Design a protein around this ligand. Structure first.
Ligand SMILES: O=C(O)C[C@H]1C=CC(=O)O1
Ligand SMILES: O=C(O)C[C@H]1C=CC(=O)O1
Ligand SMILES: O=C(O)C[C@H]1C=CC(=O)O1
Ligand SMILES: O=C(O)C[C@H]1C=CC(=O)O1
Ligand SMILES: Oc1ccc(F)cc1O
Ligand SMILES: Oc1ccc(F)cc1O
Ligand SMILES: Oc1ccc(F)cc1O
Ligand SMILES: Oc1ccc(F)cc1O
Ligand SMILES: Oc1ccc(F)cc1O
Ligand SMILES: Oc1ccc(F)cc1O
Ligand SMILES: Oc1ccc(F)cc1O
Ligand SMILES: Oc1ccc(F)cc1O
Ligand SMILES: Oc1ccc(F)cc1O
Ligand SMILES: Oc1ccc(F)cc1O
Ligand SMILES: Oc1ccc(F)cc1O
Ligand SMILES: Oc1ccc(F)cc1O
Ligand SMILES: Oc1ccc(F)cc1O
Ligand SMILES: [Cl-]
Ligand SMILES: [Fe+3]
Ligand SMILES: [Fe+3]
Ligand SMILES: [Fe+3]
Ligand SMILES: [Fe+3]
Lengths: 238, 200, 238, 200, 238, 200, 200
């Protein structure tokens, strides 16, 4: 079983978005009004699931093939790849990376999406993989389209892919969103702008990666992820 | 001062989180293996229990699109981190509220006692992380049990909550669902009865 | 019939791309090696077709509806609109604007396109319209995807829409390409870079136009076009 | 100096120009009205002629994806600018090379004489603009007729070409296609026999 | 017989003052805590009253004559004039412009004003007019004095004139305040500073306009007003 | 992106708004023609109704200096924009709360049904804009009628309010005031029972 | 975008390249082991062939200081990267043009067929890289065989050359040199008959 053998650097909750960001309207009633209670790290917080023994299907990381209903999806073929490291720069191997997204026209395959843009019969919008022994992950997909939504009267999400990353403990687990280099919707989005620091926003922008492209086939984007730094315990209980 | 690489910032999971993390709930086909809400095979050691709850916003309305991750010790106080659908017990699981009733469920065993880093026993607890549309960074809490009053009163984590009235928000209520032992743990994100949320 | 009643400002052929731009490989053998011969404007050059009496179908400007085979195209729904003016700032009304493009995945509906990305059964890729009495045009379409092509070994066109504009004479007629604000492929493209002056490249970049968007429906881009300045003849033959 | 707004810069039409401007050639359905290569209804005034040609690159190879626009006076020396598929004659038309043989065709009438801006007669001519993959800004030329030698020798536009040998590149060759009067006008973009191209 | 024929550009509610601006104390209890609910424009929102046939008295725009009780008001004689346009720069003709203000000493003719500065027996402080066919309006008045008020313990409004403008629809209707060039009270006022963006504050500052003054008579200030941009509907319900 | 001229920013109307827009309420004389609270003359077609209400702040206290503008269809569901005091009906009017009691009144007819931009019928409503001291930009709301329950349930605007409980805040209560049909519509700017406010 | 470390830029080998890479040709002594122009020892399996050729500049003049590197499969279509002078066959070698006559020679076996990355057979070929004074970055080409016409016609690399006439520049001519099977492969760097050069 798991052991308490490390500590994780405390989060900067001014680098992360705060809970109450009223321009993102749904945050108003879904943000605590009392302060978070700080607690010291114990085995409950410094351990978490490892997914090395989860059974992955052959196409779980390949959204061009994992919802195959007679053909290929319509849209901009792209590889999305990167490295997961911690704040000390150490790779995070064998960690679970999950992603979900709309199709090329901004339509989600979800029962609650009422946007008029059509579903793509060959696109589902879900991927997962494990980082390799050096911390690298890779997905193949189509670039999602921007998504209008009922926030302000003319609000549109930039093109984006939702990400979840487990990391070594429940203290490191993170959900975030990837945006695409140059997208003019990024500075206008109230969800992006839930992050107060512009340098933090830049950390969510994936860069065009021509080096990783397959000529005559697909482009590529690179999105590196940084989880909380992990260190050994020291000088405790004395 | 020493400044490390900044952590990637959080963003909301959004209301279509189910596409990625709760496929059946999205209305979609599932893969051969999914991480979900049945932590214990029938023959896992310990007391088999159902956990259930609803999630409320600051106006007292159900948060029907919430997604929860849980992490708990097994009945013997051991964290089983080698996730595997063939395990008798997994310490990790996922659940989500139904869209009609706003209710999530978890099938598990009552966790055994684990010590904190100073060697002091913590009362039996489930660690919970809550995600949803409108939640920019997930909310951490703990589910404790109302039939562990003696242990709860001595828990070094519950005791870090300054007001006893706020400690009460973390105590799940024993009940019965379909005649089986259950505990209900409602979460109030904001306002009257606001659930304690942790930073660590 | 047409009359010779105006002169058109001489083109700046260092603002336009030159003929020989070898990084665009097909230009090498398809560029003249002799100098152009300058000739004065006559009625042959200062007149041209007007298309006010051309019969347009109801959906000729609407690429979401003009190749209807049972549904809507997959892709980022957008309006592409702008104004055609001359170099003196005068609107160019009742002028023919034509456009053509690939689908959301960068596939063209042309017999000679061998790219593997699929056709969209509800998308053709052709539009036309006439500017209105104030010089404005409008199309509705989906945003095209980047297009790999056999130039260098890993070359990709930025997302683009081909445009043709007639204007008042054969001296004003122009074919060009529209690119999209922020696209990181733009600085890398040898066709874009056939234009030597970076300020001229910027004139081909359409801007996101939230004011013209239809909420919960489609985004919009604005692309203004400038044709050669037209002036009255003066002090000729004396 | 006085600097006006800059003109929008040209770009190549590319090899799929037919999608937009020559729909049938792309392999695609046509619209009810298309601008194409038959300038004259059978009863239009004047001498009915076929024009045809091939386009060569600097290596002597066919440019199979070229797109041409033409502008010419009617038989009476009048430019008919009110484009209409119901007109007896349109001064404007479009054509494109076939992909197999690289040959374009135009059905028209021989143009009448028009005067230049100084009142000097120009020899009968077709104004041509050539577009293609590899051509960054279209090439302007003129097609004159080999059976108008006297007029050609006096044309104030042909006379602006310094070398008589280069003037010869603009003179179409009378021939017969299917027994009907035709003129062939081959264009050589580059190298030996390079066609004169104009700026105006 | 009003018709739905236009759309109005969505408001930037970070350019406008937000509801909750606590240094303006009365805003604390008079600001919604729930998010506004965005709704699409319908004929209910895109129409509004036209006041072309409201009956104006001869002096309704002339505050020097419209409260005449034996003489002229005391104070700095000024013309206040400007143009009403929309965000596209189009004039807004035949629109209702209303204004109200304190007298030269900062005293309002209102039963609830208990400031010790005296009323002026020849001054009322109310004007109205219609913009002309080119969008221009004009008032004649006296420059109002600053106004102390029970916000903080030593708060003073800058000299100001309240304005209401109808525009083409209930969606364009606006109430605002005009301030005067150079007034050192402007940066200190919590009502001015309810506007977060300093560039937006500048849009409320009327400029001295010597060109519009009557020598040996009255000075003049220029205050231009911009209402929401109006455009034709396009590509709706298809 | 394309940036237009910015809109002139809003400011509060302040507590002396009635000097400019409700002259009598300020304690001052009126002009020959004023825009006020009687939208319908007695001979106007439709059901003649009195509307009345009070406005509350976040502490539950009356907002005694409120100024309201209203815009509604006539009984046949047509908006009448040609404002004229000679008209039997005007679609526009103004009212204000009394300083002692905090009550506003309007004399009108019940509006007919008007379709939204997609052709879907909206339930009968009056559009309201609320201005006052403390309100930096006016608040938009709608007054619907409690005797139009079937129409209200199907209104495409009411249905954009996510929580049914909040929809209830927009429903005026039918009553009788000195023998005349009336509807009471209270507005709560903040807190318990907060009135839905719109952006468009 | 993602920018990697830039590659070290190329420079010409210059006219004294043989000091470093063809020691004998410089007029200097050799080391015990040199990389040179005999890829096959007599006992190597396959058809033993002599290759020879001359290199021409844009004026049709011999390039007498050319240096060539070659890379080819063995007779069974396998690339042998373990370079060793003890081997019966090496896939790699070097040659240079003689200063008097301008001719290079290679002694090898005809390569077997190797598949491209999509599994499509390529016609038998030798990969060549050409270096010299005046050549700033080396030129890549391929030598194919005129007695493999059927395979050459179907080669997916040859088919990427748009003009059939240019494909002909890559086809070596079978002949006999003092009683041995040989193929002549001339390279024309520039102008008439210019050899196809590749980028990859
Ligand atoms: O009942 C309470 O108020 C306590 C809170 C903790 C568990 C639950 O169901 O609600
Ligand atoms: O025959 C030539 O060389 C002249 C050129 C002009 C017409 C044509 O067919 O070619
Ligand atoms: O109180 C309510 O529930 C509804 C609100 C709408 C009219 C009114 O008088 O109050
Ligand atoms: O000359 C040619 O046509 C082909 C070229 C390839 C081998 C050779 O000797 O010359
Ligand atoms: O806890 C909070 C309470 C009120 C507020 F405005 C912000 C907070 O973060
Ligand atoms: O803000 C909105 C805009 C368009 C729409 F259809 C619904 C909305 O709630
Ligand atoms: O990014 C999103 C925005 C709005 C929504 F309803 C779902 C999303 O995934
Ligand atoms: O110490 C406590 C622990 C749990 C609780 F509900 C109340 C307490 O006072
Ligand atoms: O006409 C030309 C000839 C040779 C060259 F390198 C460039 C030219 O523009
Ligand atoms: O440069 C190329 C790259 C990939 C391919 F399939 C063909 C090419 O000509
Ligand atoms: O833009 C293009 C690029 C290459 C091609 F073959 C066709 C195009 O339309
Ligand atoms: O003047 C000329 C005109 C046409 C031509 F072919 C040759 C000439 O010398
Ligand atoms: O006289 C006063 C002075 C300052 C203040 F804030 C309130 C008052 O009543
Ligand atoms: O601008 C003002 C400030 C305070 C007040 F009471 C009334 C005003 O008109
Ligand atoms: O749909 C509704 C409309 C009005 C209301 F009061 C309650 C509702 O549930
Ligand atoms: O660098 C050099 C320059 C000229 C030359 F002849 C030989 C070289 O090696
Ligand atoms: O396809 C070909 C291959 C080699 C050659 F010499 C000519 C061809 O047409
Ligand atoms: Cl007084
Ligand atoms: Fe999303
Ligand atoms: Fe293209
Ligand atoms: Fe005031
Ligand atoms: Fe050297």
């Amino acid at each position: 079983p798991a052991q308490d053998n490390s500590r994780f650097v405390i989060r900067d909750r001014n680098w992360h978005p705060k809970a109450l960001t009223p321009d993102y309207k749904t945050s108003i009633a879904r943000s605590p009004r009392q302060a978070l209670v700080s607690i010291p790290q114990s085995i409950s917080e410094t351990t978490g699931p490892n997914f090395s023994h989860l059974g992955f299907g052959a196409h779980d990381h390949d959204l061009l093939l994992n919802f195959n209903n007679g053909g290929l999806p319509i849209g901009e073929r792209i590889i999305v790849a990167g490295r997961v490291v911690d704040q000390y720069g150490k790779p995070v191997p064998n960690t679970l990376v999950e992603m979900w997204q709309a199709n090329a026209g901004g339509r989600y395959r979800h029962k609650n999406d009422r946007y008029l843009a059509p579903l793509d019969p060959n696109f589902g919008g879900v991927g997962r993989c494990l980082t390799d022994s050096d911390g690298y992950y890779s997905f193949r997909t189509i670039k999602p389209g921007p998504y209008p939504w009922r926030n302000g009267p003319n609000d549109w999400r930039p093109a984006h892919i939702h990400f979840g990353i487990s990391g070594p403990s429940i203290a490191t687990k993170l959900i975030t969103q990837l945006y695409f280099e140059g997208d003019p919707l990024i500075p206008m989005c109230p969800i992006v702008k839930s992050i107060a620091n512009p340098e933090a926003v830049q950390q969510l922008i994936a860069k065009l990666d021509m080096n990783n492209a397959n000529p005559m086939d697909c482009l590529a984007y690179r999105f590196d992820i940084v989880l909380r730094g992990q260190r050994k315990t020291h000088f405790e209980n004395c | 001062p020493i400044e490390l690489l900044p952590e990637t910032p959080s963003q909301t999971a959004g209301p279509y989180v189910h596409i990625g993390l709760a496929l059946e709930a999205a209305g979609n086909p599932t893969r051969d293996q999914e991480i979900w809400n049945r932590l214990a095979k029938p023959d896992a050691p310990g007391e088999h229990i159902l956990l259930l709850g609803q999630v409320y916003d600051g106006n007292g309305h159900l948060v029907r699109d919430s997604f929860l991750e849980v992490w708990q010790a097994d009945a013997n106080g051991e964290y089983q981190d080698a996730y595997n659908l063939e395990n008798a017990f997994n310490s990790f699981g996922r659940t989500a509220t139904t869209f009609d009733a706003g209710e999530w469920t978890l099938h598990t065993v009552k966790p055994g006692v684990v010590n904190n880093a100073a060697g002091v026993p913590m009362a039996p607890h489930i660690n919970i992380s809550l995600f949803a549309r409108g939640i920019n960074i997930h909310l951490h809490t703990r589910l404790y049990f109302d039939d562990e009053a003696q242990a709860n009163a001595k828990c070094p984590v519950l005791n870090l909550i300054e007001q006893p009235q706020r400690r009460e928000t973390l105590i799940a209520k024993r009940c019965e669902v379909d005649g089986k032992t259950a505990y209900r743990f409602d979460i109030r994100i904001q306002g009257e009865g606001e659930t304690v949320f942790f930073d660590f």
